[PDB]
Design a protein around this ligand. Structure first.
Ligand SMILES: Cc1ncc(C)n2nc(CCc3nc(-c4ccccc4)cn3C)nc12
Ligand SMILES: [Mg+2]
Ligand SMILES: [Zn+2]
Length: 313
């Protein structure tokens, strides 16, 4: 209880910034995560013995895939930690608790395949959940781990706060289905421009938390160029394995997943930055002004992809 966590000076300082990279030492990710809950939520939010066991069971149920892995989870939790510490007073005690957990759990047990591949392969998870297949699976795995003995980190919540927090985490995890993002931003855009957006409207909060989740999940585009460039290799390594599998089923994959068409990657990042990231972080900054650094950083990296095409790198 009087047992704090402290990081080295450079991390203690760098961790508060949006473009923080968590580093290549796995064994520090759990303490980074705990350090973030303690400063974000309080030293009193979670019983340390239980939280630690929950963190380690979460790590265990992430797989060894190039991109949708344990490192991805802690990255996306840290980005949410940045958003919550730059918007201190806009968020309830419960929201802070569940959003950091939602982010850590958001891709539990990912196999490195798209919802599409599960339906074209006819995977059992496509039989059980017809939309946001993996994301419904991810939430389900979160509840599993929350019901392992000694793992209920929410034990001290009322019956009703417990249901409130499991609902914040369910919508939050569903929201990371990027297919759902496009409508969610369109609505938020129109609600802010017409002046209807109201943060005491629970269905408005839900959309807003929805957009933070897409923001945190996409945060490789908001990092320093060498981190962005090296993460994109991991992103394409999964997509190309999926394309490989698509070809095995007897289906031409989309070019994004065709390793024959690597040459077009720079042009594909452009499309993606314009269609997805820039809109994401534009709409997010209008709603949440102190997240501007995410937009500025995303814009810099768009500019760095434009450079790659012009053969300037
Ligand atoms: C979900 C996600 N998070 C973060 C990042 C950075 N990314 N980057 C993509 C692929 C973008 C992309 N690459 C192509 C393409 C590539 C080669 C040939 C032809 C097309 C199309 N698109 C959309 N997805 C994500
Ligand atoms: Mg996901
Ligand atoms: Zn993710």
């Amino acid at each position: 209880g009087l047992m704090q966590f402290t990081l080295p000076v450079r991390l203690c300082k760098e961790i508060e910034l949006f473009h923080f990279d968590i580093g290549p030492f796995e064994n520090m990710w759990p303490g980074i995560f705990v350090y973030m809950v303690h400063r974000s939520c309080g030293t009193s939010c979670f019983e340390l013995e239980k939280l630690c066991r929950f963190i380690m069971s979460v790590k265990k149920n992430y797989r060894r895939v190039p991109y949708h892995n344990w490192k991805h989870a802690v990255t996306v939790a840290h980005c949410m930690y940045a958003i919550l510490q730059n918007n201190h007073t806009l968020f309830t005690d419960l929201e802070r608790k569940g959003l950091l957990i939602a982010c850590l759990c958001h891709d539990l047990d990912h196999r490195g395949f798209s919802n599409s591949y599960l339906q074209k392969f006819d995977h059992p998870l496509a039989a059980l959940y017809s939309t946001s297949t993996m994301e419904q699976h991810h939430f389900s795995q979160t509840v599993s781990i929350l019901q392992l003995e000694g793992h209920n980190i929410f034990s001290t919540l009322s019956s009703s706060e417990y249901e409130q927090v499991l609902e914040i985490i369910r919508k939050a995890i569903i929201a990371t289905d990027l297919a759902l993002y496009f409508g969610n931003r369109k609505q938020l855009e129109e609600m802010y421009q017409t002046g209807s957006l109201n943060l005491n409207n629970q269905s408005h909060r839900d959309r807003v938390i929805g957009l933070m989740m897409t923001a945190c999940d996409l945060c490789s585009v908001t990092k320093l160029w060498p981190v962005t460039k090296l993460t994109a290799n991991d992103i394409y390594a999964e997509f190309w394995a999926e394309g490989d599998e698509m070809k095995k089923l007897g289906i031409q994959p989309i070019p994004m997943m065709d390793r024959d068409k690597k040459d077009e990657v720079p042009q594909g990042q452009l499309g993606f930055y314009n269609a997805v990231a820039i809109p994401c972080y534009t709409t997010l900054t209008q709603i949440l002004p102190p997240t501007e650094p995410l937009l500025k950083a995303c814009r810099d990296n768009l500019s760095q992809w434009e450079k790659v095409i012009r053969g300037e790198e």
